[PDB]
Request: fold
Amino acid sequence: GSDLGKKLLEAARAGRDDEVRILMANGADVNAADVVGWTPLHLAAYWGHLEIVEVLLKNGADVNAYDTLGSTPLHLAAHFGHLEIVEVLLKNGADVNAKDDNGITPLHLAANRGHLEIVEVLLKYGADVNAQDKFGKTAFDISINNGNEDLAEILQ
Amino acid sequence: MPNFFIDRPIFAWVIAIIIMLAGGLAILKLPVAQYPTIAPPAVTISASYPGADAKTVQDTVTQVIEQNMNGIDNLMYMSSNSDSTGTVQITLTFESGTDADIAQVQVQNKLQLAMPLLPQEVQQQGVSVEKSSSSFLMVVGVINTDGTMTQEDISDYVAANMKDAISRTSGVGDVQLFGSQYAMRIWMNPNELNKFQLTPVDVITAIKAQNAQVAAGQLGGTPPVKGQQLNASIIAQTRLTSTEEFGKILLKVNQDGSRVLLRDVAKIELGGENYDIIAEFNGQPASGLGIKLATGANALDTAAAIRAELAKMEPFFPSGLKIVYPYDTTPFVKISIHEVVKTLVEAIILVFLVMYLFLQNFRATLIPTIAVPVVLLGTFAVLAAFGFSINTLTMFGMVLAIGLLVDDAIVVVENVERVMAEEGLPPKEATRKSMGQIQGALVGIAMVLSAVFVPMAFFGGSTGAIYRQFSITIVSAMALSVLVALILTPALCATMLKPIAKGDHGEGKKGFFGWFNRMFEKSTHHYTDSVGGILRSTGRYLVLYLIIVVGMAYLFVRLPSSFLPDEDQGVFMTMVQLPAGATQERTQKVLNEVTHYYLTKEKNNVESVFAVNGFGFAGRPQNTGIAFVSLKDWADRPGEENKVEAITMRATRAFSQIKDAMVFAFNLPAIVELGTATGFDFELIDQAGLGHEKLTQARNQLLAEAAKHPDMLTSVRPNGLEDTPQFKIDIDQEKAQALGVSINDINTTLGAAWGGSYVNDFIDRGRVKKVYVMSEAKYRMLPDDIGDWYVRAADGQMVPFSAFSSSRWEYGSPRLERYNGLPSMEILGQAAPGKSTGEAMELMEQLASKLPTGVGYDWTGMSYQERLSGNQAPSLYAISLIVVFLCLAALYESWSIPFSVMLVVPLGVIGALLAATFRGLTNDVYFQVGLLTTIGLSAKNAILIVEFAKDLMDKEGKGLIEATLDAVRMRLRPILMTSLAFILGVMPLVISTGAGSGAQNAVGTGVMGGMVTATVLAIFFVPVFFVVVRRRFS
Amino acid sequence: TDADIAQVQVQNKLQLAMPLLPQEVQQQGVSVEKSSSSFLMVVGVINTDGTMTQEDISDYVAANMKDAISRTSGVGDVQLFGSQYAMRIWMNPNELNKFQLTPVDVITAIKAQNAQVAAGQLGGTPPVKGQQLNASIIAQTRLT
Amino acid sequence: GIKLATGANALDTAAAIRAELAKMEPFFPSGLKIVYPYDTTPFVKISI
Amino acid sequence: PGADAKTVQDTVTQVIEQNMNGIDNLMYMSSNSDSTGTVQITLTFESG
Amino acid sequence: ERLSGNQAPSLYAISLIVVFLCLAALYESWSIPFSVMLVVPLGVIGAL
Ligand SMILES: CCCCCCCCCCCCCCCCCCCC(=O)O[C@H](COC(=O)CCCCCCCCCCCCCC)COP(=O)(O)OCCN
Ligand SMILES: CCCCCCCCCCCCO[C@@H]1O[C@H](CO)[C@@H](O[C@H]2O[C@H](CO)[C@@H](O)[C@H](O)[C@H]2O)[C@H](O)[C@H]1O
Ligand SMILES: CCCCCCCCCCCCO[C@H]1O[C@H](CO)[C@@H](O[C@H]2O[C@H](CO)[C@@H](O)[C@H](O)[C@H]2O)[C@H](O)[C@H]1O
Ligand SMILES: CN(C)c1ccc(O)c2c1C[C@H]1C[C@H]3[C@H](N(C)C)C(O)=C(C(N)=O)C(=O)[C@@]3(O)C(O)=C1C2=O
Ligand SMILES: CCCCCCCCCCCCCCCC(=O)OC[C@H](O)COP(=O)(O)OCCN
Ligand SMILES: CCCCCCCCCC(=O)OC[C@H](CO)OC(=O)CCCCCCCCC
Ligand SMILES: CCCCCCCCCCCCCC
Ligand SMILES: CCCCCCCCCC[N+](C)(C)[O-]
Ligand SMILES: CCCCCCCCCCCC
Ligand SMILES: CCCCCCCCCC
Ligand SMILES: CCCCCCCCCC
Ligand SMILES: CCCCCCCC
Ligand SMILES: CCCCCC
Ligand SMILES: CCCCCC
Ligand SMILES: [Cl-]
Ligand code: NA
Reply:
C-alpha cells in the first residue's frame, strides 16, 4: 500500500472524478486494496460512480479483483442496482459467473434485490441460470421465495 | 441626607460598621469556583448494549427512548449518538432558568415507562440519567511504578478503597472512575467447547444456576406450632466469590464419569468490564478519579479536603501505587484571588499617594482609605444576597469597578478641600456647601450608570449568564459607592479634615510640595487659556470629533471578536486521529511516539503525559486517542517560548510529519460550552425518511458548495464519523431448521463469543461485580474464526457456523446522529477572517435551501443561543440610551443639555480600540465590560463639569464661556487625580505575563488606553460639547 | 398544588405497581400526564389532491408530526385521531390447521426472524498482537 | 387533539405549536395540508 | 426477598449509599439491612 | 442539642453588638451605649 493508493481508494469511494484524473496522471496504484481486499474499482462499483469505473478500467484496473470473501466489483454493482456499471464491467471482461466463498453469483444478488434490467444483462452475457450457492439455491429459487412474479417469469 | 450625616457622624460610622460585618461574614461564607454555571441545563440519558452496532443501538434503544420523551417542560432541543461501541447518549437541553432537578426527574420518569420496551440486555446494564457538565475541579491519577498492577487492577483498587471516601469528602459533588471495578471474565475456547459438545449457551445456563442467591425460609417461622422454642433463618445457595469457584462450575458429566468444569473450556480471571480504553501516565498503567465541585461548595476547601483524605489512604496502598495530580484548577483560582486582592490593595495605596501628592495632608488620605474597603466589603454582602460566588468573572468585575469606587471617594474629599481653600469656610460648613454642589449629581450618576449596566444582565443564553455576573457585581459596587458618598464620606470630611485659610493653595510652601503647587497652579492657567482658545474656534473640533467617531467605527469592525482569553493553565491536549478501521495497537504506537516527544523535546516543560488510547470527543472507536499533557510549575517555565501557546505550536509542527495519523496539540478553552470565536453549529436533518445514505450524499453536496466560498466559510467539516467496512453474516433459516439448530442458540453463540454477554453478578470481597462471558481474543479476530464456533443441534450433533451462514463485506455507520427525533448530521465551521458569524450562518442557510427534497436543517448549541441573544441587543442598547437621556434630562431640567454629556462616549472607546488593536488583542467580554466602565467614568467627569457650569449660569448669572471656564478649572484636579491613580492601578495587569495574564491583559489594556484618551480628550471636548449644545438650543 | 411534584409523587407510587401489572400492559406503555380534560385545539390534516387515504394521513401525522408536538413545552397530552401503521399479520385458521401450526408458532417465528442481533466485532477489544482488521459484525436486522 | 399542560399559558403554547407545524409543512407530500377546525385561543386573543 | 442482612447490605444498601453523594443540604444518612431482605436508607436534610 | 449549644455564644455576641450599634445611632453617642450595655451582667446573673 502506497500514499497515492490510499488517496485513490478515498477518491474512488467519494466519487471525486477530478481528483481520480490527477491521481491516474501521477500513477496512483489501481490495484491498491484496503484490509478487506476492496480495490478502487470495488469502491466505485459499490457507491455507483460510473465515470471513475470507466477511468480505472482504462488505467488497467483488475475487472475480476476479489475481496477476502471472494466478491468482485460485478457482485457489488449487480447487488446495488447500478445497471450502467454492470454493462461497462461486462464489456471490459468481468466474469459473469464469478462465485464468492458462499457460491453466490451476480445473478443471485440481482435476483434477491429484484433488479430486472440487471438480470437480463447478466443472462445476455451468458450468466449460468442453473448456478447453485452453498445451500443449493438458484436465482429462480430466490425469485419464488421473494414472491417476485416478473423475475420468476424471466428466469424460465 | 449628607447634611443629616454631617451632624450625625456616629450614625454614619454605625452604617459603615454594619456594612463591614455583613461583608466580613459574606467573605467567609461565599462559595469559591473558577467559573459559575453558564450553559443552560442539559440532561444526558446514557445506555450500553454489549457487542451492539450503531444501527442495532439506534433501532432498539435510541428511537424508543426518543419517542417517549414527551410531556417534559421547557425542552429547547434533543440530540443523540448511537455508535458501534454499543453505546447511546441522548442529550436534552432545557431553557435557561429551568430547575435542573425537575428537568432530570421529568426525563428519568418518562424513561422509566419506556424501559419495558428496551432489549433485556439493555435493561440489565441500566440507563443512566445525569445532570450534564464538563468542568472538573481536578483529576486524581492513580499509577503503578513497580510493574505489578495493570490498569484493570488499579481501577478495581480505586473503586474498592478510594472512590466512595472521595464521594463522601466535604464539597465533592460527583466522582467518575477512569475505568471499571473488576468483572469475572470467562474467556471461552471454542476448540474445548466443541470437544465436549458444549456451546456458550451451556456456559451461561450453568453460571446462572451455580452463581445465584436462592431464597429459603425460617425454622419455627410464623404461623408456628404452639410450643416452638427456636426461630432461625435458613441460608440456601448464595453468590460465588472467587475465580476458583467459577473454575469448578459443572458443565457436563461424561459417559465414563469424568467431570467437565468451566476451567476446562475457558480462562477465568478478574479483569475490566471493557477493554476499549488503554490509559498510561508516562508509559505506566493508570486509572484515576474525575472530581466535580458540589453546588455552593468552596473549591479551595474541597481540594484541600480531597488531598487530606488521599493522605489517609497512603498507608494502605499496595507497593508501587502512587497518587498524581495531572489536572487541578485550585492553584490557578488561588493565584486569581491573590492577584485581585493585590490589585485592590495597590489601588488603595496609589489613591493614598495621589491624594497626598495633591492635597498634602494625611487626614485627607485616610478618608478614601476607609470608604473604598467599606464599599468593597458591602459589595460581597450583596453578591452573597444574590447567591453569587467569588469566581473569575465576579472578581474581575470588582477590578473593572475600581475606577468608579476610587472617583466617588476622591470627588467628595477634593471638592471639600477646594471650597475651604477658595472661600475659607471651616470643615463642617465647607462639607455642607461642597455636598450641596455634588449631591444631586451623585444621585444622577447612580441612575445613569444603572441605565448603562442593568440592561447588560438581561441578555439570554450562555453569554447572558456571563454578562449577568459583571452587571450585578458592578451595579452593586457602584450603588454602595454612592450611598457611602452621601452618608459616610461627608461625615468623615466634616470631622477629620483640618481648615485651609482662604487663598492658601500651598504656593508659599518650600521644597517639592511648594514647587508642585506652583507648577500645577501655573499648569491650570495654561489649561484654562487652551480651553479659552478652543472655545473661540469650536468648528474644527466638531470636525476632529467626527474623525474620532469614524476612526472608532473603523477600528471596531477590524477588531476580531472572541469570548474569554486562552490561559496558561499548566495543561493542554494532543488529539491522535488515525484512518478509519485502524486498530488499538496502531493508535498505541502513535501515542508512544507523541509521549516520547514530550518527555524528550519538552523535558524542561512537561511533567507528565496522560495517554488515553481509544477515546475521542466525537466517538471513541479503536482509531482515536488523546494525550493530556501536564506542565511543570509556572516558576520553572520562564519566557513566552516555554508557555502553553509556544509548546502547542512546536508540538503541532513536529507531529505534522507523522504519516497516516492526524496529530495536533491545542490549549484548553476558558469555558468549554461557549465554543470557538465566530464558530457555528449546523444540523442537517432527514425530514422525509430518506435514510442514512441519501442524507450522507446531501451532507457531501452541502460540504462541496461550502468549500467554494472560502471568502465567507472556513473549516466546514462534519462532527461525526464516516461509514466503514462491516461484516454482514446471513443465517440461513431453512438450513438451521433442516439440521435442528435453534436461532436463539446461533444468535447467543455468535453474540456471547464475538460481542460478550453480561450473565449475572458475583460478590468480590464484599462488593457486587459483573460476570462477563466472551471468546478469548485469538478465536474472534478474523472471518475464518467464524467457522471454528459450533452449535449443538436437537439430535446432539455439533454443527459449525459455516454450515448454516453466508457472509459479505458492506459499508455502514459506526455512529448514527439524531436531532429532535429525526436522523441528522452535525456540521461545524466558522466565519472567514473579517466576516461575522451572522454572515457565515446566512450563507449556510442559502446553500442548505439548494439540497435535495426532504433534507431540512436547524441551528444548535452556540448558534441557537446567538440567534436568540443577537435579537435582544438592539432593544437593550436602545433602553440604555433612552433611560440615560431621561435621567440627565431630570438632573439638568433640560431636553438639550443631556447631549453635552452623552457625546463623551467615543472619547474613551477610541483609546480602548487603539490599545487593543496595537497589542494584538480581541473584542472579548473583559474588553466590552471595560468600555462600559470607561464610558461610565468619562460620563461622570462630564456630568459634574456640566452641573458646575449650569449652576454658575443659573445661580451666579455668569456667561456660558465664563461658567464653562470656571467649571473645567475646578474639575481639572479631581479628574487628573482619579485618572493618575486608576491608570497606575491597571498598569500591572497590562504588563502581567504570569498565570491568568490573558484575563489581566484583556481587563487592563482596553481600560488603560481608554482612560488615557478619555482623560486627555474630555477635559478639552466636554467644554466644547456644552458650549455647542447651549448655543444651538437658545 | 405544584403539578410537577404531583406527577412525581403519583409516578413514584406507580413504579411500585408497574412490575405487578401484566407484561402486555407494560409493553403498551403506562403514561402519567398533567393536563386539562378539555382540548386546547384540534390540528386537522387532509390531502386536497386525494392522493392519500384516512389511514395514510394518520400514519404520516403519527410518524412525522405527533412526536415533535408532544415534546413542545405546555403540551400536556396529544391524541392522534387515527392510528400509526403497524405490520399487521392477519392469520387464517384454515391454513394454520392445514399445516398443523398455531398463533404460538407464528409469534415464535416473528420473534426469531424479525430480530436485531448484537453480534460483536472482528478484531474487537481486547485484541491479539498484530491485529489489522477491526469491523462490526452485522447479523439479523429488523424486517422493513 | 392537543390538551394544555397544567398551569401552562394557552396562547404561548398555541404559538409554539404553530411554529413547530411551520417547520414540518415544507417537507409534506403533495396535497397534504393543515386545517384549523377547533381552536379555543383565537377567542382569547380577539376578545382581549 | 429471602436474602440475609450481609447479602442485602453488599448488593443493595452500599450500591444505593455510594450514589447518595452531591445532594444539597444533606446533614446525615442512616440505614439498616435485615434478615428478611429489607433495606431502609433515611436521608435527613438541614432545617428549611 | 450539640448545634444549639455550639452557636449560642456567637448569638449572644452579635445580639450585644447590634443593640450597642442601634443605641450609638439613635443617641448619636458612644458614651450612652457603653453606659447602658454595662447593665447586661446585672440582668444575666439574676437569670442564672
Ligand atoms: C422611577 C419611577 C417609579 C415611581 C417612583 C415615584 C417617586 C419618584 C421620586 C420622587 C422624588 C421627588 C422629590 C420630592 C421632594 C420634595 C421637597 C420639596 C422641597 C425642596 O426644595 O426639596 C428639597 C430637596 O431638594 C433639593 O434641594 C435637591 C436639589 C435639586 C434637585 C436635584 C435633582 C436630583 C437628582 C435627579 C436624578 C434623576 C432621577 C431620575 C428618576 C427638600 O427641602 P425641604 O422641604 O426639606 O426644606 C424645608 C422647607 N420648609
Ligand atoms: C494623538 C492625540 C491627538 C488628540 C487630539 C488633539 C486635541 C487635544 C489637544 C488640544 C490642545 C489645545 O490647544 C489650543 O488650541 C487652540 C486652537 O483652537 C489654540 O487657540 C488659538 O487659535 C484660536 C482660534 O484662532 C485663537 O482664538 C486663540 O487666540 C489661539 O491661541 C490654543 O492657544 C491652544 O492652546
Ligand atoms: C481534563 C480537562 C478537560 C478539558 C476538555 C477540553 C474540551 C475540548 C474538546 C474539543 C476538542 C476537539 O478539538 C477541537 O476543539 C478545540 C477546543 O479546545 C479547538 O481549539 C480551538 O479553541 C481553543 C480555545 O482554547 C484555541 O486555543 C484554539 O486555537 C482553537 O482552534 C480545536 O481547534 C478543535 O480541533
Ligand atoms: C474518558 N475518560 C475520562 C477516561 C480516561 C481514562 C480512562 O482510563 C478511562 C476513561 C473513561 C472510563 C469510562 C468507563 C465506563 N464506566 C464508568 C465503567 C464504561 O462504562 C466504559 C464503557 N466502554 O462502557 C469504559 O470503558 C470505562 O470502564 C473505562 O474503561 C474508562 C477508562 O478506562
Ligand atoms: C465590632 C463592634 C463595633 C463597635 C465599635 C465601637 C466604637 C469604637 C471602636 C474602637 C476604635 C477606637 C476609638 C473609638 C472611640 C470611641 O468610640 O469612644 C470615644 C468616646 O467614647 C466618645 O464619647 P462621647 O462623649 O459619647 O462622644 C460622642 C460625641 N457626641
Ligand atoms: C452615557 C451613554 C452610554 C450609552 C452606551 C451604553 C450601551 C450599553 C448597552 C448594553 O447594556 O450592552 C452591554 C454590552 C454587552 O455586550 O457591552 C458592550 O459590548 C459595550 C458596548 C459599547 C458600545 C460603544 C458605543 C459607541 C457608539 C455610541
Ligand atoms: C432598567 C433597565 C431594564 C431592562 C429591561 C430589559 C427587558 C427588555 C426585553 C428584551 C427582549 C425584547 C425582544 C424583542
Ligand atoms: C471603627 C469605628 C471608629 C469610630 C471612631 C469615630 C469617632 C468619631 C467622633 C467624632 N466627634 C464626635 C468627636 O467629633
Ligand atoms: C422613547 C421616549 C423618548 C423621550 C423623548 C422625549 C423628548 C421630548 C422633547 C420635547 C421638546 C420640547
Ligand atoms: C435578572 C435580574 C437582574 C436584576 C439586576 C438588578 C441589580 C441591582 C443590584 C443592587
Ligand atoms: C500650546 C498648547 C497648550 C496646551 C497646554 C495644556 C496644559 C494642560 C495641563 C494639564
Ligand atoms: C476561604 C477562602 C476565602 C477567600 C476570600 C477571597 C476574597 C476576595
Ligand atoms: C437630597 C439627597 C437625595 C438622596 C436620595 C437618594
Ligand atoms: C456579657 C458581657 C457584657 C458587658 C458589656 C460591656
Ligand atoms: Cl496631616
Ligand atoms: Na433470537
About this structure: Chain F touches chain B through eight residues (CB under 8 Å). Helices of chain F lie at 2-26, 31-37, 40-47. The two ends of chain F are 20 Å apart (CA to CA). The pocket of MIY (ligand 4) is lined by residues B 48, 177-180, 273-274, 276-277, 279, 290, 612, 615 (CB under 6 Å).
